[PDB]
Amino acid sequence: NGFPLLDGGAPLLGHIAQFFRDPVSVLKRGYKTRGKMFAMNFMGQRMNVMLGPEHNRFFFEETDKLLSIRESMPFFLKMFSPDFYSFAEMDEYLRQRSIIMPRFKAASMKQYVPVMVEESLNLVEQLGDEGEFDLIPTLGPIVMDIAAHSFMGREFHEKLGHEFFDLFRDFSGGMEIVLPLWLPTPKMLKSQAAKKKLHTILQSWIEKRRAAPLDPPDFFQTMIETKYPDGRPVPDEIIRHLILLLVWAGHETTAGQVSWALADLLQHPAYAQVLRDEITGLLGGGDGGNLSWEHAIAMEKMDLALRETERLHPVAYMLSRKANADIVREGYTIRKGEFVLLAPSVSHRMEETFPNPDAYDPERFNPANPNAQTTSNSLIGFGGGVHRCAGVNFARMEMKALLVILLQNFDMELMDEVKPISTYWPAQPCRVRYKRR
Amino acid sequence: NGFPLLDGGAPLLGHIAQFFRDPVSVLKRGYKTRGKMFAMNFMGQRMNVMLGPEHNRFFFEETDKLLSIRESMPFFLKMFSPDFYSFAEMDEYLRQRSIIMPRFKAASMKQYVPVMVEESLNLVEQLGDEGEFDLIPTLGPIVMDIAAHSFMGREFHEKLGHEFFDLFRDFSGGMEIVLPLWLPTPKMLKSQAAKKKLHTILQSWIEKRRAAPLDPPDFFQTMIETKYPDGRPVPDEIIRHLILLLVWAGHETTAGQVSWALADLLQHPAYAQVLRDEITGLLGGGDGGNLSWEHAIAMEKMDLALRETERLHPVAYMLSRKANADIVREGYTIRKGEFVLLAPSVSHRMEETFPNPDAYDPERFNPANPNAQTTSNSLIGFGGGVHRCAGVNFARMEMKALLVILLQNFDMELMDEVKPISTYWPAQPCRVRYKRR
Numbered sequence: 063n064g065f066p067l068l069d070g071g072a073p074l075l076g077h078i079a080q081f082f083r084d085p086v087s088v089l090k091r092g093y094k095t096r097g098k099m100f101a102m103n104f105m106g107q108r109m110n111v112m113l114g115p116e117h118n119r120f121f122f123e124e125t126d127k128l129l130s131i132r133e134s135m136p137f138f139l140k141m142f143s144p145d146f147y148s149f150a151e152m153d154e155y156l157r158q159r160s161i162i163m164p165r166f167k168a169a170s171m172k173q174y175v176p177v178m179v180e181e182s183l184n185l186v187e188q189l190g191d192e193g194e195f196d197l198i199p200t201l202g203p204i205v206m207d208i209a210a211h212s213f214m215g216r217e218f219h220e221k222l223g224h225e226f227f228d229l230f231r232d233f234s235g236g237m238e239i240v241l242p243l244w245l246p247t248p249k250m251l252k253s254q255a256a257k258k259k260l261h262t263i264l265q266s267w268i269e270k271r272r273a274a275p276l277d278p279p280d281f282f283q284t285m286i287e288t289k290y291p292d293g294r295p296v297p298d299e300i301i302r303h304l305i306l307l308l309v310w311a312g313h314e315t316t317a318g319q320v321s322w323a324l325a326d327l328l329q330h331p332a333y334a335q336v337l338r339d340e341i342t343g344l345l346g347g348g349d350g351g352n353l354s355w356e357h358a359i360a361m362e363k364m365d366l367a368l369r370e371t372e373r374l375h376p377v378a379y380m381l382s383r384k385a386n387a388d389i390v391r392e393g394y395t396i397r398k399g400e401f402v403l404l405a406p407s408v409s410h411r412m413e414e415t416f417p418n419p420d421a422y423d424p425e426r427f428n429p430a431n432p433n434a435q436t437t438s439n440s441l442i443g444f445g446g447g448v449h450r451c452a453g454v455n456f457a458r459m460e461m462k463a464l465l466v467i468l469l470q471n472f473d474m475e476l477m478d479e480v481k482p483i484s485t486y487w488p489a490q491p492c493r494v495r496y497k498r499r
Numbered sequence: 500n501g502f503p504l505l506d507g508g509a510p511l512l513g514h515i516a517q518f519f520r521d522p523v524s525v526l527k528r529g530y531k532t533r534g535k536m537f538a539m540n541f542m543g544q545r546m547n548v549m550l551g552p553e554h555n556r557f558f559f560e561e562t563d564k565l566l567s568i569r570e571s572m573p574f575f576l577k578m579f580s581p582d583f584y585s586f587a588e589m590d591e592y593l594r595q596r597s598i599i600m601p602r603f604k605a606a607s608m609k610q611y612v613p614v615m616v617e618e619s620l621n622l623v624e625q626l627g628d629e630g631e632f633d634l635i636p637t638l639g640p641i642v643m644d645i646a647a648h649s650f651m652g653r654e655f656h657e658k659l660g661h662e663f664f665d666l667f668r669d670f671s672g673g674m675e676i677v678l679p680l681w682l683p684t685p686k687m688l689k690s691q692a693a694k695k696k697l698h699t700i701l702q703s704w705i706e707k708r709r710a711a712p713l714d715p716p717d718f719f720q721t722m723i724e725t726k727y728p729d730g731r732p733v734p735d736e737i738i739r740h741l742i743l744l745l746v747w748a749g750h751e752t753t754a755g756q757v758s759w760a761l762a763d764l765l766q767h768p769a770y771a772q773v774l775r776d777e778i779t780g781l782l783g784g785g786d787g788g789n790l791s792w793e794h795a796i797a798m799e800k801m802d803l804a805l806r807e808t809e810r811l812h813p814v815a816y817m818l819s820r821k822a823n824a825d826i827v828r829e830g831y832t833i834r835k836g837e838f839v840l841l842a843p844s845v846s847h848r849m850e851e852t853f854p855n856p857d858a859y860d861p862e863r864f865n866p867a868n869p870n871a872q873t874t875s876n877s878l879i880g881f882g883g884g885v886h887r888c889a890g891v892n893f894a895r896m897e898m899k900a901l902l903v904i905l906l907q908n909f910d911m912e913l914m915d916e917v918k919p920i921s922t923y924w925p926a927q928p929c930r931v932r933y934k935r936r
């Protein structure tokens with residue numbers, strides 16, 4: 063019946079402890095020894111992994127039909143609500159998604175670039191003329207500054223920014239597990255407590271700005287005044303959930319992804335020089351404070367670098383669904399209720415799709431390359447289909463801004479070898495030595 | 500087909516969040532609205548709860564046959580080994596259990612009483628003439644002193660005791676859960692690290708005492724020299740696992756259970772006086788330092804109090820198995836691979852078995868009571884059958900010693916109301932005000 067089973071499973075535990083220790087290597091061993099469809103054994107549960115563009119297309123296409131999203135993160139419901147976004151019924155999901163999409167399509171990035179540039183320059187200021195910085199701990203707070211400043215406004219970021227960021231780390235803990243009596247980790251209580259406080263703080267700011275509006279409107283003003291397509295008003299609670307969702311969905315992902323991207327550049331000086339020349343051609347000298355959206359969109363080699371870092375180090379190293387019904391696929395049956403996985407980390411390094419898959423070669427995405435590797439559903443570090451990452455343009459633009467400003471200001475080198483760890487981040491410490499240019 | 504489903508389940512999550520918040524109240528609601536057999540819904544998994552003496556007897560009798568122990572705590576395997584104790588094949592389990600049973604049958608408690616009394620008197624010394632103490636944080640370290648002193652010896656407890664107790668808190672974290680990419684909590688790494696250090700420290704002590712034996716032998720000396728019944732030697736690794744198992748199995752359980760027992764006594768002064776008179780009749784005045792095993796076994800009213808605290812507040816509030824095959828039971832089918840639970844917390848308060856079940860009435864266990872409630876498999880806070888708690892006599896004797904010595908030395912009162920939370924402990928702070936007698 064089932065997907066071909068990966069061998070080497072331990073008694074009782076199966077592969078789960080191996081996965082615990084190094085998930086991508088477990089996933090790669092499935093590709094190398096079993097192929098594009100294989101089962102892992104997680105404590106007696108079959109985990110059905112599919113690889114490559116055809117299976118990726120199927121996974122995205124069948125989400126909300128044969129494949130269920132909610133069981134990938136059931137306690138999203140408690141962080142947010144059972145009627146919110148991808149957890150809501152189809153009609154309601156689409157209505158709420160219609161609030162988000164116009165604010166995050168590629169055209170809409172004009173809005174956000176000045177805040178991205180300003181906070182990047184604040185980072186340059188904090189770093190000074192020379193020193194060393196740890197990647198994730200340094201860039202994480204900047205990603206968060208950009209999120210809060212962009213989606214809540216400058217004033218909120220100055221006045222309430224400190225209290226807001228502390229509640230978020232607790233809020234983000236709300237995906238906790240349990241101990242043998244089904245006794246819970248503290249973290250779920252702290253997450254609930256932070257959620258209630260985040261909601262009161264956000265509601266106060268909604269009321270503040272509706273009493274005292276900012277015209278012309280920023281993101282926040284437009285958000286709290288938006289209605290659904292049919293004309294009905296968007297409930298305040300939905301607004302609050304949406305904003306928290308954006309900050310949550312974009313925080314640890316972007317901080318890790320951009321850290322991988324800088325690391326890739328610092329390990330490939332020839333291409334970093336390609337990037338420095340593109341930035342210099344567009345911006346001239348100086349600290350990069352003149353970086354505009356119009357400059358940004360012209361940065362074609364930066365775009366290639368960001369695609370290549372996504373390919374080599376997708377922080378979304380695995381994606382997850384549960385089957386709503388039995389699925390027969392190429393002779394194997396996924397049973398109803400079993401997990402179904404994509405693995406961007408492994409799919410992205412299939413020689414069948416990406417020749418020389420361990421090489422850093424951004425020009426493989428250049429459409430003028432006859433050898434180009436741009437088939438649809440082959441680069442899936444942002445998902446796909448209806449449930450593609452809503453922030454994919456915001457994330458790529460923010461990485462571009464952070465890297466441009468850092469490249470323009472600093473000579474940099476990696477101090478440590480990079481190491482691993484859904485979530486795939488450089489192992490701390492991953493430090494950069496720098497000296498201002 | 501299934502066990503009657505408890506109503507009130509939330510979308511997707513079922514009852515799991517309700518259970519998270521207050522498990523005994525979920526379990527009680529199953530008894531009150533569905534009866535002795537009911538299903539809970541944990542994120543789409545049926546949890547089959549059975550209640551009362553007949554079902555308890557079945558659960559214990561069928562463990563290792565229709566019911567599997569390992570899936571109740573799969574990562575016991577990593578804390579210990581897949582070939583250790585209840586995780587080993589039947590023959591090997593029984594061989595290793597044959598090392599433990601002679602050291603913990605009721606007759607064998609003579610060995611341990613002097614260490615229990617000494618450490619209890621050390622507690623009296625630390626408390627001084629008056630003050631306040633928090634139950635779990637104060638008595639937890641004493642339970643651990645008694646374990647290390649009893650099973651490793653006085654010298655180990657003095658020299659290596661501090662380092663040993665710090666590694667154990669990390670070791671005990673090794674029952675961790677995960678986050679949405681199956682990304683693990685730190686705690687499993689700390690647990691593994693502590694396990695390796697605990698094993699090296701224990702092996703050094705095995706080698707020390709085999710070079711320099713303690714004659715007459717203490718527990719440790721006899722343990723490292725024991726052979727299996729057939730004459731074959733017990734591997735050092737098994738010895739180390741066994742000792743760690745005893746300390747682990749007895750630490751948080753006994754500290755919580757004895758705290759409940761003191762709380763019950765401080766809430767029922769008339770019976771505490773019954774206890775004080777029994778202690779005075781046996782020991783006279785003084786600090787209780789003359790408490791001997793021969794005195795201890797005569798303390799029939801203390802025995803009743805400990806049974807009644809076990810009934811009202813079993814720290815093992817729930818017990819867990821997975822079905823090895825479909826089990827038909829009174830018209831309902833447990834499917835293979837589903838969880839099967841006992842709930843001592845609820846079973847112990849069934850009016851059908853224990854009339855006036857919320858009353859503290861230790862005399863209900865007195866065999867001279869015509870109304871006595873002593874049917875087999877009705878008091879199950881220590882499990883039952885082949886897999887009954889191996890330490891049940893050691894735990895009861897230690898609680899008796901700790902309470903005797905405290906009652907003999909201090910007038911005490913509860914400062915706070917008691918509150919809840921496998922594991923069921925008084926909610927901290929649960930404080931006792933005391934003044935020496």
Ligand code: HEM
Nearest residue numbers: 148308311312315316319378443444445449451452453457
């Ligand atoms: C480099 C950074 C990021 C990566 C790698 C990333 C990746 C992803 C992936 C893989 C998905 C699809 C999940 C699945 O299929 O199970 C997703 C969903 C989502 N992401 Fe991102 N993300 C990033 C940044 C952001 C940012 C900055 C935002 C918001 C501004 C955001 C908003 C969302 C939302 C709202 C969804 C849900 C889409 C839906 O179900 O309709 N993410 N993200």
Ligand code: HEM
Nearest residue numbers: 585745748749752753756815880881882886888889890894
């Ligand atoms: C008041 C304290 C304690 C309580 C409430 C308690 C309770 C239990 C329960 C309910 C079980 C059976 C688990 C199941 O059926 O799933 C058990 C097993 C066990 N306990 Fe205790 N325990 C306590 C103290 C101790 C102490 C002090 C030791 C050791 C000195 C100990 C050693 C063990 C061992 C070795 C097992 C495994 C039995 C087997 O599977 O053969 N426990 N305990």
